[PDB]
Amino acid sequence: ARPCIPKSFGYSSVVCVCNATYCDSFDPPTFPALGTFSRYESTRSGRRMELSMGPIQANHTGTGLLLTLQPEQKFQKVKGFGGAMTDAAALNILALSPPAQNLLLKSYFSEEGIGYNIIRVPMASCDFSIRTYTYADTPDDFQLHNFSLPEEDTKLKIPLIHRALQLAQRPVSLLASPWTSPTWLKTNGAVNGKGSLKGQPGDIYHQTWARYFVKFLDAYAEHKLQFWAVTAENEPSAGLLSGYPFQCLGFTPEHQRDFIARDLGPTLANSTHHNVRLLMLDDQRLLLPHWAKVVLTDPEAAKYVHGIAVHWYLDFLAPAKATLGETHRLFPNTMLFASEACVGSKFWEQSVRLGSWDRGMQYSHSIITNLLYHVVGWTDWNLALNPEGGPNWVRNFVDSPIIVDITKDTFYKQPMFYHLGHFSKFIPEGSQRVGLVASQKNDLDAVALMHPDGSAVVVVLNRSSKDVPLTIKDPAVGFLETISPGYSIHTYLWRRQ
Ligand SMILES: *[C@@H]1O[C@H](CO)[C@@H](O[C@@H]2O[C@H](CO)[C@@H](O[C@@H]3O[C@H](CO[C@H]4O[C@H](CO)[C@@H](O)[C@H](O)[C@@H]4O)[C@@H](O)[C@H](O)[C@@H]3O)[C@H](O)[C@H]2NC(C)=O)[C@H](O)[C@H]1NC(C)=O
Numbered sequence: 366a367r368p369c370i371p372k373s374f375g376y377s378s379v380v381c382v383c384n385a386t387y388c389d390s391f392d393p394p395t396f397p398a399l400g401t402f403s404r405y406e407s408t409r410s411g412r413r414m415e416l417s418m419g420p421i422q423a424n425h426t427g428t429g430l431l432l433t434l435q436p437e438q439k440f441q442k443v444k445g446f447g448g449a450m451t452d453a454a455a456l457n458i459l460a461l462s463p464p465a466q467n468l469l470l471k472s473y474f475s476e477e478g479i480g481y482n483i484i485r486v487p488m489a490s491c492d493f494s495i496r497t498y499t500y501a502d503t504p505d506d507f508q509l510h511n512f513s514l515p516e517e518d519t520k521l522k523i524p525l526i527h528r529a530l531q532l533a534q535r536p537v538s539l540l541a542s543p544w545t546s547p548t549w550l551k552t553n554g555a556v557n558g559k560g561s562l563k564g565q566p567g568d569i570y571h572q573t574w575a576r577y578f579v580k581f582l583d584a585y586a587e588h589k590l591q592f593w594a595v596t597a598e599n600e601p602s603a604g605l606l607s608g609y610p611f612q613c614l615g616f617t618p619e620h621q622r623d624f625i626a627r628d629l630g631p632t633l634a635n636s637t638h639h640n641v642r643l644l645m646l647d648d649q650r651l652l653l654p655h656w657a658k659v660v661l662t663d664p665e666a667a668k669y670v671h672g673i674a675v676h677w678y679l680d681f682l683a684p685a686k687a688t689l690g691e692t693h694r695l696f697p698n699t700m701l702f703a704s705e706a707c708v709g710s711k712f713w714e715q716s717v718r719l720g721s722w723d724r725g726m727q728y729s730h731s732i733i734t735n736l737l738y739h740v741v742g743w744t745d746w747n748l749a750l751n752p753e754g755g756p757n758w759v760r761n762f763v764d765s766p767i768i769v770d771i772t773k774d775t776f777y778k779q780p781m782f783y784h785l786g787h788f789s790k791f792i793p794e795g796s797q798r799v800g801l802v803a804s805q806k807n808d809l810d811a812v813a814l815m816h817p818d819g820s821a822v823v824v825v826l827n828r829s830s831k832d833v834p835l836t837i838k839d840p841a842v843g844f845l846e847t848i849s850p851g852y853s854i855h856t857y858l859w860r861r862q
Pocket residue numbers: 370382383384385386387
């Protein structure tokens with residue numbers, strides 16, 4: 366492991382500095398010997414997944430906070446964690462020298478980094494593009510004879526995805542999402558603004574749009590990339606809004622239901638891509654459970670829908686219990702999956718805040734709350750941005766766990782990177798969320814998972830200023846005596862047998 370080279374930009378914590386010759390690294394994860402536990406600790410003060418070990422005690426006495434593992438109490442299985450290979454991300458990574466590129470990609474995708482196993486891939490242009498394009502801009506090409514991948518895919522995104530897969534030891538799942546159709550399929554004839562597909566589900570416009578998904582997957586398959594899943598549309602509610610500023614395609618939940626049932630579901634099912642999963646919604650969880658009810662109460666739509674993709678941007682107005690909890694209750698066999706998060710997009714948020722501990726805590730608080738309400742995975746937005754939070758053709762600049770400083774052939778790993786890694790590094794695909802109850806009211810956020818081998822993983826976030834002594838009880842094994850410092854995040858690992 367190589368330590369963090371810290372740098373302050375005058376915010377609440379440090380970034381770790383990487384360049385062509387140096388980047389901080391971790392050891393590949395391992396469980397310690399039976400009878401001991403591992404603690405990985407990150408702090409506002411500058412600790413970055415510092416490993417310490419402790420004994421498991423047979424007995425515990427006292428009045429302090431106790432978190433008791435309920436290992437028999439099983440919830441959702443984890444799909445995983447990752448981020449988005451946008452045009453903007455690809456441009457920022459490729460602007461680094463090749464050795465710096467390799468250290469950034471290792472930071473995310475290697476076991477010396479944080480073990481990402483998900484990459485979200487835009488289907489043509491979005492706001493995090495410098496050019497507006499689709500794969501089929503030749504007007505009225507209903508046959509899609511002129512469908513093709515431009516250089517944004519063949520020269521930037523696809524070769525970086527191959528390099529990520531070659532560094533990953535875990536199987537990586539690709540997730541595709543479209544922002545806009547070709548403008549000649551749209552009521553408004555523009556990539557942005559209020560507008561939907563022309564006509565109605567089951568017609569030539571909708572059949573052409575469903576076939577565009579298959580042409581997309583065919584073209585990526587010619588480049589030796591296969592997808593785990595696609596979404597039915599990125600943020601379909603966006604295209605319902607007057608003056609929506611960037612690429613969108615409006616669907617009411619009824620429109621999405623009928624498009625899935627008549628066009629997208631049957632087209633994917635009748636193709637070589639029949640095993641690719643379809644996720645609905647791909648929008649703010651405030652739209653649940655209503656959207657889920659509208660789509661999944663129609664059996665002809667429900668039979669094509671694998672899962673419900675959620676974005677975090679209205680989480681502050683949408684309690685998890687009423688949205689995620691109620692959706693899981695109504696549709697327990699339809700997985701919930703978090704597919705897009707970033708800080709900096711809101712009117713009251715600065716785009717980039719280098720070294721922000723607050724933004725790290727936003728990520729870990731989000732991931733814990735999602736895991737506690739049945740969500741199987743959590744996906745960051747842009748993998749890397751420049752110090753302005755771009756590039757972005759509408760200047761919708763936001764923050765990223767990695768910020769690239771081209772002039773210094775440098776990149777900065779922010780608190781968000783480490784907060785994400787406290788989960789992604791230690792929670793492989795097939796891990797299962799298990800119960801964890803507190804003996805008393807407390808200011809901590811915590812979640813417990815059982816690793817596929819039966820071992821325990823617990824993440825404890827303290828967003829308060831106060832140090833909290835605590836004990837973790839595993840009824841089979843014994844007690845971990847520990848302390849959760851103010852503004853810390855911990856990952857605990859131990860074997861149970
Ligand atoms: C890529 O980033 C590398 C890591 O930041 C850069 O290496 C660094 O370059 C600076 C300037 O030459 C050096 O700073 C000096 O550091 C010494 C103290 O060195 C020791 O203690 C530090 C702090 O714990 C430790 O990190 C080092 O390993 C040393 O043990 C001071 O006495 C000087 O006054 C001055 O501050 C760094 O030593 C050096 N860091 C490392 C880890 O090598 C490298 O220059 C960058 N590459 C490019 C191409 O820009």
